[PDB]
């Protein structure tokens, strides 16, 4: 009597698989038939069993999800595995017990059938082109069989280092390079090892942004910089200086329109004005921002959504945003322009420059599968095109995309602001820094702490 298992393959969590174990003898003679699993480096774990008496038992993990069935005609025991999970992943073995005639019994085993539950999970921000990133992921599943789900959870920059440390979290994490040094110091990211030929496809300056202590900690995707987005119909010759916005606002408020609406909550949007001169520069830049809210030119709790919506609706003449925001404007019927950020105290407003980068989670089993996705499928002409047609990436890191980038007037304006700004250091202290600026700007905006007292608490 020999037991032969079948139906073992790769599947997506939530999917299904029917294991079948056929014997070379009648199942009637068997007392008990059942399924055991063995994951790498672990003990035998019974999942299900069926006795000659038709009673079926299951282990608590698989209970409710798996059903053990039997067909005495086909001389086969089945395991219908529904709603699969990564914890299920193991080698599944078929077992049969037979009482002899005398007191003793016989245990019979099979070859084993491998079941792999694999899901490629990607964490990217909701303001980016996750739908397009999914279209790349859909082509990956066609050529391999691995599922590529794209998730966009709130506060992922500070949810990733908590979840990825303890739990599983994502396989690959997408965020501007500045947050990655903190992940690298903490040991939350795998070292990137790309071959020369892949390495050569991207601009050498882009690789520098994704380097911490002489180790590549991510894959560079695109350079991001804030620009001044303006409605050409409401404002044909927009302000070249910050100091002439109050005058323009007085003019526009008479006609039931705002001058400038942008995200005041997130400090990345307010930093260019703050850092225009520089300290004395931070005091100057912020006082101006405070005076705008004090003169009722800007709203106190202006966030990403009400600013975006207001510009797209045609209520505000200007807004401060990144490449990613353009597609939503195109959807609306607004003749828009992207240009240089306004100057403050003569000198330019220095926006921080981000390099969108993809890193592999140190606690991921799919490190080689993610490297394949990132190199051969995402960081390709075809791959970046898909992401870019959803929501624009900005100035891509791919060398082959220079011609297409250069043909776009908005990219030109983005690069103009990126040169006037500076790339963020990747250092672990960036997190504490950003938090210090986030509070400082909110406190001064609402009317709690003074501009002098804001820089005091922030420098500490
Ligand atoms: O607001 C501070 C925040 O700014 C930057 O995050 C940007 C991100 O880089 C952009 O891609 C865009 O989506 O908006 C974010 C701000 O809303 C820094 O990268 C980040 O560390 C910092 O927390």
Tab-separated table of C-alpha atoms and ligand atoms in Angstrom:
chain	number	residue	atom	x	y	z
A	1	UNK	CA	0.000	0.000	0.000
A	2	UNK	CA	1.456	3.375	-1.048
A	3	UNK	CA	0.065	6.891	-0.511
A	4	UNK	CA	0.556	9.473	-3.333
A	5	UNK	CA	-0.135	13.191	-2.609
A	6	UNK	CA	-0.924	15.865	-5.225
A	7	UNK	CA	-2.164	19.465	-5.581
A	8	UNK	CA	0.756	21.299	-4.014
A	9	UNK	CA	1.626	24.663	-5.525
A	10	UNK	CA	1.980	28.442	-5.099
A	11	UNK	CA	-1.060	30.623	-4.235
A	12	UNK	CA	-2.190	34.070	-3.079
A	13	UNK	CA	-3.373	34.562	0.579
A	14	UNK	CA	-7.137	34.292	0.521
A	15	UNK	CA	-6.930	31.790	-2.332
A	16	UNK	CA	-7.516	28.070	-2.367
A	17	UNK	CA	-5.884	24.663	-2.944
A	18	UNK	CA	-7.258	21.087	-3.028
A	19	UNK	CA	-4.719	18.493	-1.847
A	20	UNK	CA	-5.542	14.914	-2.842
A	21	UNK	CA	-3.964	11.735	-1.483
A	22	UNK	CA	-4.637	8.484	-3.335
A	23	UNK	CA	-3.774	5.053	-1.964
A	24	UNK	CA	-3.029	1.682	-3.668
A	25	UNK	CA	-5.658	-0.105	-1.629
A	26	UNK	CA	-9.122	0.385	-0.164
A	27	UNK	CA	-9.564	3.239	2.350
A	28	UNK	CA	-12.220	1.022	4.031
A	29	UNK	CA	-9.306	-0.930	5.635
A	30	UNK	CA	-7.875	2.245	7.155
A	31	UNK	CA	-8.892	3.383	10.634
A	32	UNK	CA	-7.737	6.969	10.399
A	33	UNK	CA	-6.647	9.118	7.475
A	34	UNK	CA	-5.205	12.579	7.913
A	35	UNK	CA	-3.028	15.496	6.879
A	36	UNK	CA	0.137	16.651	8.721
A	37	UNK	CA	2.306	19.706	7.797
A	38	UNK	CA	5.983	20.588	8.314
A	39	UNK	CA	7.285	24.131	7.832
A	40	UNK	CA	11.061	24.725	7.568
A	41	UNK	CA	12.739	24.062	10.927
A	42	UNK	CA	9.647	23.006	12.891
A	43	UNK	CA	7.971	19.925	14.397
A	44	UNK	CA	5.178	17.872	12.757
A	45	UNK	CA	1.770	19.619	13.035
A	46	UNK	CA	-1.505	17.722	12.517
A	47	UNK	CA	-4.013	19.903	10.628
A	48	UNK	CA	-6.875	17.442	9.956
A	49	UNK	CA	-8.000	13.836	10.373
A	50	UNK	CA	-10.963	11.648	9.364
A	51	UNK	CA	-11.795	8.331	11.047
A	52	UNK	CA	-13.575	5.305	9.602
A	53	UNK	CA	-16.442	6.483	11.812
A	54	UNK	CA	-16.845	9.639	9.635
A	55	UNK	CA	-15.739	12.005	12.486
A	56	UNK	CA	-13.525	14.944	11.411
A	57	UNK	CA	-11.105	16.848	13.730
A	58	UNK	CA	-8.928	19.922	13.036
A	59	UNK	CA	-6.203	22.013	14.687
A	60	UNK	CA	-7.298	25.465	15.984
A	61	UNK	CA	-5.228	27.440	13.353
A	62	UNK	CA	-6.886	25.761	10.319
A	63	UNK	CA	-10.352	25.302	12.010
A	64	UNK	CA	-13.117	27.065	10.064
A	65	UNK	CA	-10.884	27.391	6.977
A	66	UNK	CA	-9.959	23.773	6.013
A	67	UNK	CA	-12.269	20.743	5.348
A	68	UNK	CA	-11.086	17.088	5.318
A	69	UNK	CA	-13.118	15.015	2.854
A	70	UNK	CA	-13.010	11.389	1.709
A	71	UNK	CA	-14.088	9.489	-1.408
A	72	UNK	CA	-14.062	5.710	-0.845
A	73	UNK	CA	-14.789	5.164	-4.601
A	74	UNK	CA	-11.686	7.029	-5.758
A	75	UNK	CA	-9.744	5.712	-2.696
A	76	UNK	CA	-8.715	9.288	-1.908
A	77	UNK	CA	-8.560	11.680	1.074
A	78	UNK	CA	-8.832	15.414	0.275
A	79	UNK	CA	-7.840	18.680	1.962
A	80	UNK	CA	-9.780	21.687	0.623
A	81	UNK	CA	-7.746	24.622	1.879
A	82	UNK	CA	-9.806	27.856	1.593
A	83	UNK	CA	-8.858	31.438	2.615
A	84	UNK	CA	-5.112	30.656	2.782
A	85	UNK	CA	-2.522	32.562	4.930
A	86	UNK	CA	1.338	32.817	5.037
A	87	UNK	CA	1.357	30.814	8.326
A	88	UNK	CA	0.000	27.812	6.333
A	89	UNK	CA	3.146	27.613	4.127
A	90	UNK	CA	4.652	24.116	4.680
A	91	UNK	CA	5.201	20.593	3.222
A	92	UNK	CA	1.879	18.725	3.551
A	93	UNK	CA	2.016	14.939	4.209
A	94	UNK	CA	-0.740	12.313	3.986
A	95	UNK	CA	-1.038	9.711	6.786
A	96	UNK	CA	-3.052	6.480	7.102
A	97	UNK	CA	-3.374	4.081	10.087
A	98	UNK	CA	-4.513	0.377	9.779
A	99	UNK	CA	-5.292	-2.058	12.598
A	100	UNK	CA	-3.847	-5.465	11.758
A	101	UNK	CA	-6.351	-8.250	12.627
A	102	UNK	CA	-4.314	-8.791	15.774
A	103	UNK	CA	-3.780	-6.031	18.365
A	104	UNK	CA	-0.993	-4.126	16.460
A	105	UNK	CA	-1.327	-1.288	13.861
A	106	UNK	CA	0.470	0.030	10.748
A	107	UNK	CA	1.275	3.715	10.004
A	108	UNK	CA	1.660	4.697	6.329
A	109	UNK	CA	3.034	7.972	4.950
A	110	UNK	CA	3.345	9.688	1.593
A	111	UNK	CA	6.046	11.599	-0.344
A	112	UNK	CA	4.835	15.021	0.722
A	113	UNK	CA	3.373	17.908	-1.306
A	114	UNK	CA	4.706	21.488	-1.036
A	115	UNK	CA	2.250	24.384	-0.510
A	116	UNK	CA	3.575	27.954	-0.724
A	117	UNK	CA	1.468	30.946	0.238
A	118	UNK	CA	3.325	34.054	-0.969
A	119	UNK	CA	2.171	37.648	-1.267
A	120	UNK	CA	4.244	40.586	-2.343
A	121	UNK	CA	3.090	43.557	-0.282
A	122	UNK	CA	4.149	47.105	-1.018
A	123	UNK	CA	3.731	50.162	1.199
A	124	UNK	CA	3.567	53.511	-0.699
A	125	UNK	CA	1.866	56.814	0.217
A	126	UNK	CA	-1.701	57.563	-0.937
A	127	UNK	CA	-0.704	60.719	-2.759
A	128	UNK	CA	1.408	58.556	-5.177
A	129	UNK	CA	0.455	56.308	-8.096
A	130	UNK	CA	-0.423	53.059	-6.387
A	131	UNK	CA	-2.887	52.085	-9.167
A	132	UNK	CA	-0.086	52.334	-11.701
A	133	UNK	CA	2.287	50.498	-9.340
A	134	UNK	CA	-0.385	47.764	-9.232
A	135	UNK	CA	-0.423	47.558	-13.069
A	136	UNK	CA	3.337	46.725	-12.850
A	137	UNK	CA	2.516	44.214	-10.125
A	138	UNK	CA	-0.154	42.655	-12.368
A	139	UNK	CA	2.434	42.106	-15.155
A	140	UNK	CA	4.760	40.519	-12.522
A	141	UNK	CA	2.076	37.950	-11.527
A	142	UNK	CA	1.600	37.025	-15.228
A	143	UNK	CA	5.347	36.253	-15.622
A	144	UNK	CA	5.855	34.525	-12.183
A	145	UNK	CA	2.614	33.750	-10.313
A	146	UNK	CA	3.228	35.926	-7.211
A	147	UNK	CA	0.483	38.324	-6.040
A	148	UNK	CA	1.446	42.004	-5.864
A	149	UNK	CA	-0.930	43.957	-3.576
A	150	UNK	CA	-0.254	47.679	-3.108
A	151	UNK	CA	-1.228	49.239	0.264
A	152	UNK	CA	-1.387	52.935	1.273
A	153	UNK	CA	-1.932	53.228	5.065
A	154	UNK	CA	-2.036	56.515	7.003
A	155	UNK	CA	1.173	57.505	8.862
A	156	UNK	CA	3.189	54.718	7.101
A	157	UNK	CA	6.487	56.588	7.689
A	158	UNK	CA	6.009	56.071	11.502
A	159	UNK	CA	3.847	52.850	11.305
A	160	UNK	CA	6.562	50.967	9.268
A	161	UNK	CA	9.374	51.083	11.917
A	162	UNK	CA	6.945	49.868	14.632
A	163	UNK	CA	5.214	47.078	12.598
A	164	UNK	CA	8.284	45.955	10.572
A	165	UNK	CA	10.382	45.585	13.746
A	166	UNK	CA	7.893	43.353	15.599
A	167	UNK	CA	5.364	41.990	13.097
A	168	UNK	CA	5.746	41.256	9.378
A	169	UNK	CA	4.705	44.547	7.769
A	170	UNK	CA	5.609	45.078	4.098
A	171	UNK	CA	8.204	43.440	1.868
A	172	UNK	CA	9.135	46.697	0.150
A	173	UNK	CA	8.683	50.241	1.616
A	174	UNK	CA	8.378	53.408	-0.541
A	175	UNK	CA	9.184	56.810	0.951
A	176	UNK	CA	11.538	59.800	0.346
A	177	UNK	CA	15.201	58.861	1.129
A	178	UNK	CA	15.313	61.054	4.310
A	179	UNK	CA	13.432	58.493	6.500
A	180	UNK	CA	15.677	55.557	5.436
A	181	UNK	CA	18.770	56.359	7.537
A	182	UNK	CA	16.744	55.852	10.699
A	183	UNK	CA	15.503	52.502	9.408
A	184	UNK	CA	19.110	51.531	8.450
A	185	UNK	CA	20.536	52.430	11.913
A	186	UNK	CA	17.709	50.474	13.612
A	187	UNK	CA	18.362	47.450	11.375
A	188	UNK	CA	14.968	47.483	9.648
A	189	UNK	CA	16.377	47.363	6.051
A	190	UNK	CA	18.263	44.777	3.980
A	191	UNK	CA	21.444	45.842	2.140
A	192	UNK	CA	20.827	46.391	-1.608
A	193	UNK	CA	23.228	44.476	-3.925
A	194	UNK	CA	22.488	45.418	-7.560
A	195	UNK	CA	24.756	44.213	-10.405
A	196	UNK	CA	26.825	46.797	-12.386
A	197	UNK	CA	24.528	46.622	-15.450
A	198	UNK	CA	21.408	47.451	-13.385
A	199	UNK	CA	23.413	50.019	-11.329
A	200	UNK	CA	24.508	51.757	-14.550
A	201	UNK	CA	20.862	52.315	-15.721
A	202	UNK	CA	20.314	55.005	-12.999
A	203	UNK	CA	22.111	58.385	-12.518
A	204	UNK	CA	25.107	58.032	-10.100
A	205	UNK	CA	23.947	61.052	-8.005
A	206	UNK	CA	20.633	59.228	-7.274
A	207	UNK	CA	22.508	56.241	-5.735
A	208	UNK	CA	24.270	58.613	-3.280
A	209	UNK	CA	20.930	59.615	-1.668
A	210	UNK	CA	20.198	55.941	-0.881
A	211	UNK	CA	23.568	55.292	0.870
A	212	UNK	CA	24.122	55.052	4.688
A	213	UNK	CA	27.626	54.260	6.057
A	214	UNK	CA	28.899	52.939	2.720
A	215	UNK	CA	25.949	50.571	2.161
A	216	UNK	CA	23.099	50.913	-0.407
A	217	UNK	CA	19.867	50.855	1.658
A	218	UNK	CA	17.245	51.411	-1.132
A	219	UNK	CA	16.604	51.738	-4.915
A	220	UNK	CA	16.251	55.375	-6.168
A	221	UNK	CA	13.034	56.013	-8.162
A	222	UNK	CA	12.593	59.762	-8.682
A	223	UNK	CA	13.625	63.214	-7.518
A	224	UNK	CA	10.803	65.199	-5.899
A	225	UNK	CA	10.572	68.942	-5.324
A	226	UNK	CA	7.696	71.317	-4.562
A	227	UNK	CA	6.765	73.963	-7.187
A	228	UNK	CA	4.262	76.804	-7.384
A	229	UNK	CA	1.141	75.511	-9.126
A	230	UNK	CA	-1.006	78.405	-10.468
A	231	UNK	CA	-4.268	78.980	-12.371
A	232	UNK	CA	-3.292	80.842	-15.603
A	233	UNK	CA	-6.863	82.144	-16.084
A	234	UNK	CA	-7.190	83.677	-12.590
A	235	UNK	CA	-3.484	84.723	-12.565
A	236	UNK	CA	-1.480	85.034	-15.862
A	237	UNK	CA	1.663	86.719	-14.418
A	238	UNK	CA	1.978	85.082	-10.962
A	239	UNK	CA	4.043	86.436	-8.048
A	240	UNK	CA	7.821	86.086	-8.313
A	241	UNK	CA	8.101	87.223	-4.624
A	242	UNK	CA	6.336	86.056	-1.395
A	243	UNK	CA	5.987	89.660	-0.148
A	244	UNK	CA	3.609	90.651	-3.018
A	245	UNK	CA	1.019	87.901	-2.178
A	246	UNK	CA	-0.867	90.014	0.459
A	247	UNK	CA	-1.557	92.686	-2.194
A	248	UNK	CA	-2.689	90.035	-4.691
A	249	UNK	CA	-4.891	88.420	-2.008
A	250	UNK	CA	-6.656	91.744	-1.283
A	251	UNK	CA	-7.338	91.994	-5.042
A	252	UNK	CA	-8.620	88.379	-5.285
A	253	UNK	CA	-10.715	88.379	-2.057
A	254	UNK	CA	-12.802	91.226	-3.553
A	255	UNK	CA	-13.764	88.823	-6.409
A	256	UNK	CA	-14.581	85.927	-4.013
A	257	UNK	CA	-11.267	84.094	-4.513
A	258	UNK	CA	-8.169	83.210	-2.419
A	259	UNK	CA	-4.582	83.862	-3.602
A	260	UNK	CA	-2.670	80.930	-2.121
A	261	UNK	CA	-3.878	77.750	-0.370
A	262	UNK	CA	-1.457	74.942	0.529
A	263	UNK	CA	-0.884	72.308	3.245
A	264	UNK	CA	0.151	74.179	6.428
A	265	UNK	CA	-0.065	71.070	8.675
A	266	UNK	CA	2.847	69.112	7.076
A	267	UNK	CA	6.175	71.045	7.549
A	268	UNK	CA	7.596	69.965	4.157
A	269	UNK	CA	5.285	72.515	2.513
A	270	UNK	CA	6.097	75.439	4.860
A	271	UNK	CA	9.881	74.738	5.041
A	272	UNK	CA	10.770	76.496	1.720
A	273	UNK	CA	9.515	79.852	3.065
A	274	UNK	CA	11.135	79.218	6.480
A	275	UNK	CA	14.496	78.291	4.831
A	276	UNK	CA	14.491	81.049	2.169
A	277	UNK	CA	17.092	83.238	3.961
A	278	UNK	CA	18.529	80.645	6.378
A	279	UNK	CA	18.651	81.609	13.266
A	280	UNK	CA	17.643	85.001	11.740
A	281	UNK	CA	16.390	83.331	8.554
A	282	UNK	CA	13.964	80.952	10.268
A	283	UNK	CA	12.603	83.838	12.399
A	284	UNK	CA	12.018	85.977	9.270
A	285	UNK	CA	10.416	83.276	7.160
A	286	UNK	CA	8.064	82.021	9.865
A	287	UNK	CA	6.969	85.519	11.022
A	288	UNK	CA	5.810	86.127	7.418
A	289	UNK	CA	3.841	82.856	7.444
A	290	UNK	CA	2.323	83.840	10.817
A	291	UNK	CA	1.361	87.285	9.450
A	292	UNK	CA	-0.561	85.631	6.543
A	293	UNK	CA	-2.844	83.752	8.995
A	294	UNK	CA	-3.009	86.849	11.278
A	295	UNK	CA	-4.125	89.033	8.283
A	296	UNK	CA	-6.839	86.395	7.405
A	297	UNK	CA	-5.182	85.673	4.011
A	298	UNK	CA	-4.762	81.939	4.800
A	299	UNK	CA	-6.944	79.624	6.980
A	300	UNK	CA	-5.626	78.318	10.316
A	301	UNK	CA	-6.140	74.558	9.674
A	302	UNK	CA	-5.344	74.440	5.925
A	303	UNK	CA	-4.611	70.769	5.053
A	304	UNK	CA	-3.720	68.807	1.886
A	305	UNK	CA	-7.350	67.998	0.994
A	306	UNK	CA	-9.056	71.408	1.339
A	307	UNK	CA	-6.079	73.095	-0.438
A	308	UNK	CA	-6.103	70.596	-3.358
A	309	UNK	CA	-9.888	70.694	-3.688
A	310	UNK	CA	-9.965	74.505	-3.581
A	311	UNK	CA	-7.367	74.819	-6.371
A	312	UNK	CA	-8.990	72.132	-8.548
A	313	UNK	CA	-12.450	73.717	-7.999
A	314	UNK	CA	-11.057	77.090	-9.091
A	315	UNK	CA	-11.352	78.909	-5.729
A	316	UNK	CA	-7.610	79.678	-5.161
A	317	UNK	CA	-5.221	81.178	-7.759
A	318	UNK	CA	-2.153	79.338	-6.398
A	319	UNK	CA	-1.000	76.210	-4.495
A	320	UNK	CA	2.301	74.584	-3.440
A	321	UNK	CA	2.601	70.869	-4.328
A	322	UNK	CA	4.651	68.124	-6.016
A	323	UNK	CA	4.618	66.153	-9.290
A	324	UNK	CA	2.112	63.673	-7.880
A	325	UNK	CA	-0.571	66.423	-7.619
A	326	UNK	CA	-0.659	67.273	-11.348
A	327	UNK	CA	-2.856	64.372	-12.558
A	328	UNK	CA	-5.763	65.472	-10.318
A	329	UNK	CA	-5.556	69.017	-11.781
A	330	UNK	CA	-5.611	67.545	-15.347
A	331	UNK	CA	-8.787	65.639	-14.338
A	332	UNK	CA	-10.359	69.022	-13.438
A	333	UNK	CA	-10.931	71.785	-16.012
A	334	UNK	CA	-8.216	74.169	-14.730
A	335	UNK	CA	-5.571	75.646	-17.115
A	336	UNK	CA	-2.625	75.279	-14.736
A	337	UNK	CA	1.022	76.249	-14.688
A	338	UNK	CA	3.924	74.927	-12.589
A	339	UNK	CA	6.698	77.427	-11.821
A	340	UNK	CA	9.498	78.652	-9.552
A	341	UNK	CA	8.519	79.073	-5.884
A	342	UNK	CA	8.242	82.731	-4.771
A	343	UNK	CA	11.379	84.476	-3.419
A	344	UNK	CA	11.494	85.811	0.164
A	345	UNK	CA	13.765	88.703	1.199
A	346	UNK	CA	15.129	88.655	-2.370
A	347	UNK	CA	16.719	85.210	-1.924
A	348	UNK	CA	14.887	82.074	-3.182
A	349	UNK	CA	12.678	79.763	-1.115
A	350	UNK	CA	14.749	76.587	-0.611
A	351	UNK	CA	12.418	73.562	-0.844
A	352	UNK	CA	13.717	70.250	0.483
A	353	UNK	CA	14.501	67.684	-2.200
A	354	UNK	CA	13.310	64.133	-1.824
A	355	UNK	CA	14.389	61.024	-3.681
A	356	UNK	CA	11.487	58.576	-3.796
A	357	UNK	CA	13.174	55.287	-2.899
A	358	UNK	CA	12.187	51.625	-2.543
A	359	UNK	CA	13.781	49.616	0.296
A	360	UNK	CA	13.498	45.897	1.186
A	361	UNK	CA	12.336	45.058	4.774
A	362	UNK	CA	15.066	43.198	6.732
A	363	UNK	CA	12.432	40.851	8.242
A	364	UNK	CA	11.039	39.683	4.850
A	365	UNK	CA	11.349	36.161	3.357
A	366	UNK	CA	10.679	37.492	-0.192
A	367	UNK	CA	13.958	39.513	-0.502
A	368	UNK	CA	15.028	37.942	-3.826
A	369	UNK	CA	11.452	38.127	-5.254
A	370	UNK	CA	11.272	41.865	-4.369
A	371	UNK	CA	14.712	42.516	-5.963
A	372	UNK	CA	13.331	40.912	-9.167
A	373	UNK	CA	10.214	43.098	-9.065
A	374	UNK	CA	12.186	46.288	-8.356
A	375	UNK	CA	14.940	45.707	-10.961
A	376	UNK	CA	13.384	43.862	-13.925
A	377	UNK	CA	9.771	45.132	-13.659
A	378	UNK	CA	9.547	48.540	-11.846
A	379	UNK	CA	12.860	50.330	-12.650
A	380	UNK	CA	12.324	49.962	-16.382
A	381	UNK	CA	11.041	52.337	-19.062
A	382	UNK	CA	7.771	50.445	-19.239
A	383	UNK	CA	7.474	50.120	-15.474
A	384	UNK	CA	8.017	53.753	-14.538
A	385	UNK	CA	5.699	54.798	-17.395
A	386	UNK	CA	2.831	52.911	-15.781
A	387	UNK	CA	3.354	54.636	-12.418
A	388	UNK	CA	3.828	58.018	-14.087
A	389	UNK	CA	0.594	57.954	-16.122
A	390	UNK	CA	-1.361	57.338	-12.875
A	391	UNK	CA	0.274	60.069	-10.742
A	392	UNK	CA	3.540	61.752	-11.962
A	393	UNK	CA	6.793	60.629	-10.286
A	394	UNK	CA	8.720	63.768	-11.062
A	395	UNK	CA	12.283	63.538	-12.382
A	396	UNK	CA	12.875	59.829	-12.641
A	397	UNK	CA	16.222	58.290	-11.761
A	398	UNK	CA	16.284	56.247	-14.996
A	399	UNK	CA	18.871	57.478	-17.531
A	400	UNK	CA	16.698	56.395	-20.468
A	401	UNK	CA	13.928	58.821	-19.444
A	402	UNK	CA	15.919	62.037	-19.899
A	403	UNK	CA	14.350	62.941	-23.252
A	404	UNK	CA	10.783	62.511	-22.030
A	405	UNK	CA	11.488	64.438	-18.817
A	406	UNK	CA	13.071	67.301	-20.690
A	407	UNK	CA	9.990	67.629	-23.007
A	408	UNK	CA	7.740	68.420	-20.014
A	409	UNK	CA	7.468	72.080	-18.867
A	410	UNK	CA	6.406	71.095	-15.354
A	411	UNK	CA	9.521	68.976	-14.886
A	412	UNK	CA	11.608	71.963	-15.843
A	413	UNK	CA	9.918	73.987	-13.045
A	414	UNK	CA	10.452	71.062	-10.642
A	415	UNK	CA	14.180	70.893	-11.478
A	416	UNK	CA	14.384	74.676	-11.116
A	417	UNK	CA	13.072	74.459	-7.548
A	418	UNK	CA	15.199	71.370	-6.791
A	419	UNK	CA	18.389	73.284	-7.667
A	420	UNK	CA	17.260	76.225	-5.456
A	421	UNK	CA	16.607	73.744	-2.660
A	422	UNK	CA	18.778	70.966	-1.272
A	423	UNK	CA	18.676	67.202	-0.807
A	424	UNK	CA	17.727	66.072	2.701
A	425	UNK	CA	20.375	64.213	4.691
A	426	UNK	CA	19.262	60.633	5.355
A	427	UNK	CA	20.523	60.712	9.022
A	428	UNK	CA	18.588	59.005	11.879
A	429	UNK	CA	17.878	62.376	13.577
A	430	UNK	CA	15.605	63.491	10.622
A	431	UNK	CA	12.516	62.035	12.399
A	432	UNK	CA	12.998	64.034	15.593
A	433	UNK	CA	13.806	67.078	13.440
A	434	UNK	CA	10.632	66.845	11.343
A	435	UNK	CA	8.463	66.380	14.483
A	436	UNK	CA	10.073	69.457	16.056
A	437	UNK	CA	9.234	71.541	12.954
A	438	UNK	CA	5.698	70.036	12.640
A	439	UNK	CA	4.754	71.137	16.179
A	440	UNK	CA	6.541	74.517	15.891
A	441	UNK	CA	4.648	75.488	12.711
A	442	UNK	CA	1.241	74.310	14.074
A	443	UNK	CA	1.710	76.150	17.413
A	444	UNK	CA	2.667	79.423	15.676
A	445	UNK	CA	-0.154	78.998	13.115
A	446	UNK	CA	-2.926	78.379	15.661
A	447	UNK	CA	-1.707	81.013	18.117
A	448	UNK	CA	-0.132	79.265	21.125
A	449	UNK	CA	3.667	79.801	21.099
A	450	UNK	CA	5.616	82.853	19.837
A	451	UNK	CA	7.986	82.725	16.794
A	452	UNK	CA	11.052	83.251	19.072
A	453	UNK	CA	9.880	80.493	21.491
A	454	UNK	CA	9.189	78.080	18.584
A	455	UNK	CA	12.847	77.980	17.440
A	456	UNK	CA	13.979	77.641	21.106
A	457	UNK	CA	11.992	74.425	21.692
A	458	UNK	CA	12.876	73.152	18.193
A	459	UNK	CA	16.672	73.540	18.482
A	460	UNK	CA	16.690	71.382	21.670
B	1	LIG	O1	5.952	66.965	6.185
B	1	LIG	C1	7.168	66.486	6.623
B	1	LIG	C2	7.477	65.179	5.877
B	1	LIG	O2	7.898	65.685	4.634
B	1	LIG	C3	8.447	64.825	3.726
B	1	LIG	O3	7.440	63.977	3.301
B	1	LIG	C4	6.834	64.331	2.113
B	1	LIG	C5	7.130	63.229	1.088
B	1	LIG	O4	8.483	63.225	0.864
B	1	LIG	C6	6.433	63.607	-0.210
B	1	LIG	O5	6.595	62.540	-1.088
B	1	LIG	C7	4.964	64.017	0.012
B	1	LIG	O6	4.162	62.925	-0.144
B	1	LIG	O7	4.646	64.616	1.225
B	1	LIG	C8	5.337	64.303	2.388
B	1	LIG	C9	4.860	65.432	3.326
B	1	LIG	O8	3.463	65.562	3.293
B	1	LIG	C10	9.590	63.982	4.289
B	1	LIG	O9	9.961	63.035	3.361
B	1	LIG	C11	9.122	63.263	5.570
B	1	LIG	O10	10.126	62.619	6.283
B	1	LIG	C12	8.552	64.289	6.565
B	1	LIG	O11	7.900	63.574	7.577
